[PDB]
């Protein structure tokens, strides 16, 4: 089957401030893997933006966008985008969209568990009240 | 009269600690030839547009005229074989770097 | 490292560390380096 | 200060005491639970209903 | 060292004696303190019997 | 209403063994905030 490598990848000549959005992408990926650990975090330390070893930035952006849990269709949609900031915008959007759900689940878990703790802790207080009333509030013996 | 160092996409702002990890292994030869000297040191320059490893060693006008000499701290070489530490300590505008 | 301690005996070094936060391309920094006068670099930095 | 201090220290001792009672509860439950599992493991024992 | 330790000793003994004389406050007062702790710990309204 | 700062504060000239009680006052304050912690302990170090 006929195929051709029509991999368009235009980028501005001045490449100093253009990697700052990448810096925000890796900061969101660091927050996604720190607050929602999926894979080990050593791989993020292996491939950093400060090493100047990112010979293929398109590949780095795709690998960073791969941690997102967005449906495959969304990936196809990111490939449909031709401009570079549009795909960066979409990758960040995918990350935040997952991030809100993650934060909801985490807050809910700690909240629900603390409700269980406030349940049993008040029961511990009630148990102490009973025990101290069933012991100290006597003259000689109950029986 | 030392060859220029290969910054290799590493900006070193004045008075801003930086690390340099070039992939080439020829600069380590220069790092081992300076160990017997009493005082250890290195010079720092910045590269111009369209980085090219062949141009760093071929011509000397590519590099900008400003330069920043500083002292070496300590070598580590955890992963690579060329893990030098750089600093922006003494800025200078050499009359003629060539 | 605060400005209220008066321990910034060499302000140029602190200003360079503060100017490093700017995201302007390195070449632009060299252009800032061409400037000799202090208010010229300060004004260019503010513009940046 | 001492008058408050005595009551405070009393409360602290009292709190740890109730907590230690919970520990004396559950630690013996860990031992007895281990005992149960070993008693259940000895084939078909322990007359049932 | 002797004189300073004697000062610390006379003070520690004087403080132990004052502290013992404060412990002379009866145990009914202590149980009353715990009683007030029970009254301000949870809702007073028992409304059982 | 007429008023005056009648803040009596008599103290003995010999102030050598009078600060020995202060050591016990701060020891009791450290034990009150250590065994029954109420407020932060940074204020005591400041």
How many β-strands of chain A, per DSSP? 0
Which descriptor suits the 3D outline of chain A? Answer: rod-shaped
Structural class of chain A: mainly alpha
Beta content of chain A comes to under 5%
**Biggest sheet descriptor of chain A:** none
Query: What is the string of helix and strand elements of chain A?
Result: HHHHH
- The quaternary structure here is part of a larger assembly
**Most extensive interface: pair and counts?**
B-C, 12 and 11 residues
Query: What's the helix count of chain A?
Result: 5
Q: State the end-to-end CA separation of chain A.
A: 95 Å
Query: Which value, in Å, is the CA radius of gyration of chain A?
Result: 27 Å
Report the helical percentage of chain A: 55-70%
């Amino acid at each position: 089957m006929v195929e051709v490598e029509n991999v368009v990848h235009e980028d501005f000549q001045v490449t100093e401030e253009v990697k700052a959005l990448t810096a925000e992408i890796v900061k969101t990926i660091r927050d996604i893997i720190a607050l929602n650990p999926l894979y080990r975090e050593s791989v993020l330390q292996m491939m950093q933006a400060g090493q100047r070893v990112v010979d293929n930035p398109i590949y780095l952006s795709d690998m960073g966008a791969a941690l997102t849990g967005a449906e495959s269709h969304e990936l196809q949609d990111v490939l449909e985008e031709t401009n570079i900031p549009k795909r960066l915008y979409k990758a960040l959007s995918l990350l935040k969209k997952e991030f809100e759900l993650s934060k909801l689940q985490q807050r809910l878990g700690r909240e629900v568990e603390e409700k269980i703790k406030q349940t049993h802790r008040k029961y511990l207080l009630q148990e102490q009240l009973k025990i101290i009333k069933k012991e100290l509030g006597l003259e000689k013996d109950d029986k | 009269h030392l060859p220029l160092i290969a910054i290799t996409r590493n900006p070193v702002f004045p008075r801003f600690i930086k690390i340099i990890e070039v992939k080439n292994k020829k600069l380590v030869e220069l790092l081992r030839r300076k160990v017997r000297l009493a005082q250890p040191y290195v010079g720092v320059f910045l590269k111009r547009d369209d980085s090219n490893e062949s141009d760093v060693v071929e011509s000397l006008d590519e590099i900008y005229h400003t330069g920043t000499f500083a002292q070496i701290h300590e070598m580590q070489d955890l992963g690579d074989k060329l893990r030098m530490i750089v600093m922006g300590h003494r800025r200078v505008h050499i009359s003629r770097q060539l």
